[PDB]
Design a protein around this nucleic acid. Structure first.
Ligand SMILES: [Mg+2]
Ligand SMILES: [Zn+2]
Ligand SMILES: [Zn+2]
Lengths: 148, 151, 220, 187, 51, 86, 16, 50, 225, 79, 222
RNA sequence: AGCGGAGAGGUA
């Protein structure tokens, strides 16, 4: 019945019109399908997904970037790709992934000064959040320390 | 303010500055790879197609994140190790992970084929340059068997 | 309304004299293909040049044949004739010959000079002979023409490759000007047959197409 | 998690024995995939027997694997990480190739993590929920046989653990089978 | 093909070789024009009898 | 800076060495003024400065008095981050 | 102590 | 190799471990390997599979 | 409208409340972009309770997923309508059919990689016709809290801003209906006793179309309120 | 330009101490007042550093020579 | 080489037409075909609308009491309204009409250079017995597609998108001709489709003017 | 600078 409907129009029974490129200006061999497909735009627009952050606000209980976009926050550099950095030999990449760019407030002040001066160097210090964990386990009935 | 001077400044500073792209289900170690940016009119990351097969990432709406190595050791770790030219063979097996996936192999399997009777059957040609001169002329078939000279 | 970002060539970067690679920037969006295709079809299909069309052999009257003292074949020897690089004076066509005996590669240095017929490669191998009693003798005819003609559309008959060019590829890419959005950086890559430079080989094709719009110029 | 290639050699001679697997039909993983890119335990004793095909510590890249292939090497003992005598680590000459770099592993790139990701990644692509009829023509070898010839001349085996191998024309195993207790063999 | 190119020529010609594969692959997959249509899938006429 | 981590049970002597005061009262916040109480869970005089280098009574609003505790409500003027580890 | 940091702990364990 | 890293003891010998005690194979292998530095006999281990 | 429909579309468009269905059949007295007034047929007409059916359409207002719920009339003046038929083409409805997206001329061929995995190349003719251009609505809020150091204010007295930020307000500190703003502009100047004006979220553009102000009973009403 | 770090590995067989030699060198070219020992293309310090590793005029040994020898310049200027 | 000329303009309708070229050497039919098609769609002078300023409208997303369609649908209708102007490079047009009926383009005040090419084009339906629209319509020249976002101030001046192009569809079919005693010569048949504001001789002449300028980028004029 | 927990839907 679709073939008969095409036979009512002038359009060929095969359904596939030969086409010409706009660049070459010459025929695509083996003629191709055209038609009218009924298509939809979905509301996953890019400007509701495109997002970036250099340095914005920091969270309160952990000096870490916030989560989300409506709060102008970073991305979560999750656990599995910490394993993937372990899989490469990248140590200094990781060591700035979760110390300078992430947690230690002194180290990222030093980093921010060094980039705006023109030095590329990191000073690790200590993750704040690990020290928070140390005060949590220490806030139970547990003596936990660091050695020399 | 977005002045027309700082686009030139950014074109200075992103001359050789690799970035670390990640896809969220970061299963095996090819999930973060380094690249070099080339700036784009638009709002979406353009991504090289071969790398899609490593990222397990079709273009149905997948979202990838970018990270930036700040310190200099991290840039050298990016370009030395995590640059995409390094990762051509999986750590799982010695097979290539830069496999041409789906359109390009259709272009080849249409290219290197042979039908028995079409334009320019059985003629002789001094090399491949006359072959491409035949095909761009539209005087010979794309797939018709020809004796040529090769070196 | 009419003001256009007119390009000019930013370099003629080159490998050796039968080949070069020409870049153009900044063309308006869409104009990159409409010149890279237009200059392709003119060069690849319509260039005035001289090549070899018909050749007869001293004791061979058929394409499927051989000759004694000849390492190669006769079906093979036509391909060596297609790579010959000939420039001819204002005559339309003329015949030449090659007559020689002896062991070794009878090259294009052993073509008769015939005055204005100048060859860019006397080093060019025509065929090998391997006996002292092996003699070569053939009648080669050059001809001037206006584009590639195969033999089936056309004594041995040769594919008439009159064109000086051998490969042309435009590679349209992006280029930026300080606030403009996207522009065509057109990159031509091109090999010749050595009969002409790659530079002014473009400048004939520009000359041909400009004459094709001569009724349409509107004075500027 | 913990496992860093930290020494260059253990300097020992243990290892495991790679043979190409034969599930009971055709060979389903050949020798030159399991062996490929691993450091030998001791030398390869060629079946020109007392001929030394490769030495005792050489990495078996493709040339040496082709020389193993032409001389039909049956079973290859090889240095493995399970028997590597490294303390707190894995030596280089018991691991072999990185499989992304065409040489020996560098000292450090932690194969524990690349191991565990490279194992667990295709788990997204897995699934979740008579007699003996020989095939080809070769010689018959039996393994750990305790048998008797019956009244008619067929062989029967009084040991469960006897394995029926079809050796080829050359000398490697190309079929393998289980022969139960008191089974009427034809050959 | 790519694997033998890396085993024989090393890394750089293998990489830029793979790029040239990809660009010519879309050039000739593009210029070829391999579509799909309802006439392209062929019912065997002998299906009905085996049914 | 430091090598290995050791962990152990908590002596009450170690607990009192860690601490800086017995918290006694269950109310924390005044929520009428935004100050917290005398010795609540949020405590200025045990844990330290609410805002930067100021006492809760507001005596030493200058950086010059850094280190000495106050007498009006007894808050050791230091960084406010010192309320994070005490 | 994996890659580049394995060279670093070569240094640090080499010192103590 | 990470599975069978732990082990137990059949006889302690001149070492210090309890006999029915579990300890990792690396630490006990360096334990009796340095008791090989003296003439004394170390332990007879037994590997486990966790 | 879709070409290749399924017959359910009329029922789906009628059943959801996105359209306006003439509950009594009659003739158009009046049609406008705001309202539709229908003279009632005399046989469906009640004896008492004289009446004509008066429909108020919904113009541009907020959805719950920030889209553009909108009703457009589909009839001309002086037109017979039947009881049970729609009048206002609502959002994504075309003459009472169900019209989600738009239908286009489309071809299946790989084109230079630009449709590699599942990607879609789209001609610039589409964006020229504005036939996927859509409308969103972002309801922004800014309040007046009774806090420390007094309340925070609303008026246009703003410390240390550029004069373009001052010009885009009224005399009372509230942006006019219609001012086309970019990102970073000031919508409502809220000052903190010591500057926390409600500003446009980052990088977006658009147009103010509707201002609402609610005020607690007992507080002063300023001039724009 | 930069495509691979293959030949840098071909002169430094670790592929990890490539990063430390390169970081030591490019750190000596960004912070310290020293010119590149190779003609640049207005590149960054990174590709200049690895690019000097390509010509083999820097490895860990020459860097030991320059830290020791410039170190003795810091001794000889001390008097 | 033999050279092409304008042999004919076949004005087959008021909107569109067919020009015809003769003769062409073999291969040039596709060359000037793809070339002149791509240029005629690329860059022709146009006269699109840019700004419309309706009287009682603060923002383009409201109603207007007295017209059944929205402000926005008036903006798409005027976005498809085509005009020819000659002596200027921009112009302001005034619209005034009351009473029940369609607002056609004929009610726009026509000038000595303003030429509505299709007065049949509807704009909006007025619906009230005593009401009116009264808008000013700013129309300028231009080239290509320019959206209203990437351009460059009171609240009354609305903005719409610019669609500065006259052409609708370009088609060409090469074929042989009746050249006198000679074969392999080529009759170029171009079928352009136009809204109506560009004459075809001027169309193809401006096109080949532009492409000759782009070859003129590296060869001199002759 | 002022952003913690639930609960719901979706995205690959
Ligand atoms: Mg997906
Ligand atoms: Zn070992
Ligand atoms: Zn006090």
């Amino acid at each position: 019945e679709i073939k008969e409907l095409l036979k009512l129009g002038d359009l060929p029974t095969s359904g596939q019109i030969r086409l010409y490129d706009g660049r070459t200006g010459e025929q695509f061999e083996r003629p191709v399908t055209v038609g009218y497909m009924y298509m939809l735009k979905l509301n996953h627009l890019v400007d509701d997904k495109m997002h970036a952050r250099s340095t914005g606000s920091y969270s309160l209980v952990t000096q870490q970037p916030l989560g989300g976009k409506a709060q102008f926050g970073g991305q979560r550099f999750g656990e599995m790709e910490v394993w993937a950095l372990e899989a490469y030999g990248a140590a200094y990449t990781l060591q700035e992934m979760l110390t300078v760019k992430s947690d230690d407030v002194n180290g990222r002040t030093k980093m921010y000064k060094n980039i705006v001066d023109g030095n590329h160097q990191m000073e690790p210090g200590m993750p704040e959040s690990f020290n928070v964990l140390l005060k949590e386990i220490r806030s139970l009935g547990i003596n936990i320390e660091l050695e020399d | 303010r977005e002045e027309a001077v700082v686009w030139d400044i950014l074109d200075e500073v992103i001359r050789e500055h690799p970035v670390l792209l990640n896809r969220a289900p970061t299963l095996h170690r090819l999930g973060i790879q380094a690249f070099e940016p080339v700036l784009i009119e638009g709002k979406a990351i353009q991504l090289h197609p071969l790398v899609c097969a490593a990222y397990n990432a079709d273009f149905d709406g997948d979202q990838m994140a970018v990270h930036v190595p700040l310190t200099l050791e991290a840039q050298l770790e990016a370009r030395a190790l995590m640059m995409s030219t390094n990762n051509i063979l999986s750590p799982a097996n010695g097979e290539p992970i830069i496999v041409p996936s789906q359109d390009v192999v259709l272009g080849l399997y249409y290219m290197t084929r042979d039908c028995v009777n079409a334009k320019g059957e059985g003629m002789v040609l001094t090399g491949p340059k006359e072959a491409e001169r035949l095909y761009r002329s539209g005087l010979a078939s794309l797939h018709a068997r020809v004796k040529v000279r090769i070196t | 309304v009419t003001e256009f970002l007119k390009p000019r060539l930013v370099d003629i970067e080159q490998v050796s004299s039968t080949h070069a690679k020409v870049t153009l920037e900044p063309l308006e969006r869409g104009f990159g293909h409409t010149l890279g295709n237009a200059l392709r079809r003119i060069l690849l299909s319509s260039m005035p040049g001289c090549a070899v069309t018909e050749v007869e052999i001293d004791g061979v009257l058929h394409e499927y044949s051989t000759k004694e003292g000849v390492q190669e074949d006769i079906l093979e020897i036509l391909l060596n004739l297609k790579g010959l690089a000939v420039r001819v004076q204002g005559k339309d066509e003329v015949i030449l010959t090659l007559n020689k005996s002896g062991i070794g590669p009878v090259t294009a240095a052993d073509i008769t000079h015939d005055g204005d017929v100048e060859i860019v490669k006397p080093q060019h191998v025509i065929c090998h002979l391997t006996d002292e009693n092996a003699s070569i003798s053939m009648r080669i005819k050059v001809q001037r023409g206006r584009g590639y003609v195969p033999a089936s559309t056309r004594r041995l008959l040769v594919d008439a490759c009159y064109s000086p060019v051998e490969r042309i590829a435009y590679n349209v890419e992006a280029a930026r000007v300080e606030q403009r959005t996207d522009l065509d950086k057109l990159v031509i890559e091109m090999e010749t047959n050595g009969t002409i430079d790659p530079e002014e080989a473009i400048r004939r094709a520009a000359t041909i197409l400009a004459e094709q719009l001569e009724a349409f110029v509107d004075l500027e | 998690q913990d496992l860093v290639v930290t020494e260059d050699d253990c300097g020992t001679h243990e290892g495991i024995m790679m043979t190409p697997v034969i599930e009971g039909g055709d060979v389903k993983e050949p020798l030159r995939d399991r062996v490929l890119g691993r450091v030998t335990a001791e030398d390869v004793l060629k079946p020109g027997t007392a001929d030394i095909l490769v030495p005792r510590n050489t990495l078996l890249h493709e040339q040496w694997c082709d020389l193993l292939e032409e001389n039909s090497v049956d079973a290859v003992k090889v240095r493995s990480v399970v028997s590597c005598d490294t303390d707190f680590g894995v030596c280089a000459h018991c691991y072999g190739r990185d499989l992304a770099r065409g040489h020996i592993i560098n000292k450090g790139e932690a194969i524990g993590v690349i191991a565990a990701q490279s194992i667990g990644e295709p788990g997204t692509q897995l699934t979740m929920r008579s007699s003996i009829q020989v095939k080809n023509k070769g010689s018959i070898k039996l393994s750990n046989v305790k048998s008797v010839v019956n009244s008619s001349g067929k062989l029967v085996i009084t040991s469960r653990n006897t394995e029926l191998k079809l050796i080829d024309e050359f000398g490697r195993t190309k079929e393998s089978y289980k022969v139960p207790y008191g089974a009427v063999l034809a050959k | 093909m790519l694997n033998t190119c890396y085993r024989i020529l090393g890394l750089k010609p293998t990489v830029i070789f793979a790029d040239q594969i990809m660009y010519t692959g879309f050039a000739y997959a593009a210029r070829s024009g391999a579509s799909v249509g309802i006439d392209d899938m062929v019912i065997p006429e002998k299906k009905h009898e085996i049914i | 800076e430091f090598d290995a981590i050791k962990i152990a049970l908590a002596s009450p002597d170690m607990i009192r060495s860690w601490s800086f005061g017995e918290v006694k009262k269950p109310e924390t916040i005044n929520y009428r003024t935004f100050k917290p109480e005398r010795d609540g869970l949020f405590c200025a005089r045990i844990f330290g400065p609410v805002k930067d280098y100021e006492c809760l009574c507001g005596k030493y609003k200058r950086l010059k008095h850094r280190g000495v505790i106050c007498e009006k409500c007894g808050v050791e003027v230091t960084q406010t981050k010192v309320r994070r580890e005490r | 102590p994996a890659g580049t940091g394995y060279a670093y702990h070569q240094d640090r364990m080499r010192r103590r | 190799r990470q599975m069978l890293r732990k082990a137990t003891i059949v006889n302690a010998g001149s070492s210090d471990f309890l006999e029915g005690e579990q300890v990792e194979y690396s630490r006990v292998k360096i334990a009796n390997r340095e008791l090989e530095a003296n003439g004394k006999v170390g332990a007879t281990y037994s590997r486990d599979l966790l | 409208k879709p070409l290749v429909g399924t017959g359910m579309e009329r029922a789906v468009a009628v059943d959801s409340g996105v359209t306006a269905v003439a509950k009594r059949g009659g003739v158009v007295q009046y049609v406008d972009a705001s309202r539709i007034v229908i003279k009632v047929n005399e046989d469906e007409m009640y004896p008492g309770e004289a009446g004509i059916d008066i429909y108020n359409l919904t113009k541009y207002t907020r959805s719950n997923q920030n889209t553009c719920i909108n009703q457009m009339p589909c009839v001309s003046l002086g037109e017979p309508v039947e009881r049970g038929d729609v009048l206002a083409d609502g959002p994504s409805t075309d003459l009472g059919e169900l019209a989600l997206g738009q239908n286009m001329r489309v071809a299946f061929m790989p084109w230079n990689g630009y449709n590699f995995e599942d990607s879609i190349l789209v001609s610039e003719r589409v964006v020229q016709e504005d036939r996927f251009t859509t409308i969103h609505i972002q309801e922004l809020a800014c309040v007046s809290r009774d806090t420390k150091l007094g309340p925070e204010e609303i008026t246009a007295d703003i410390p240390n801003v550029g004069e373009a930020a001052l010009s885009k307000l009224d005399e009372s500190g509230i942006v006019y209906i219609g001012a086309e703003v970019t990102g970073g502009d000031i919508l409502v100047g809220k000052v903190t006793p010591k500057d926390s004006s409600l500003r446009v979220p980052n990088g977006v553009s658009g147009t103010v179309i509707d201002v609402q102000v609610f005020t607690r009973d007992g507080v002063e009403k300023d001039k724009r309120a | 330009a930069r495509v691979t770090v293959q030949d840098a590995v071909e002169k430094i067989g670790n592929r990890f101490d490539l990063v430390l030699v390169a970081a030591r060198r490019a750190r000596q070219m960004q912070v310290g007042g020293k010119d590149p020992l190779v003609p640049e293309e207005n590149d960054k310090t990174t590709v200049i550093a690895l690019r000097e590793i390509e010509e083999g005029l820097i490895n860990n040994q020459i860097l030991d020579v320059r830290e020791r020898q410039e170190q003795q310049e810091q001794e000889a200027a001390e008097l």
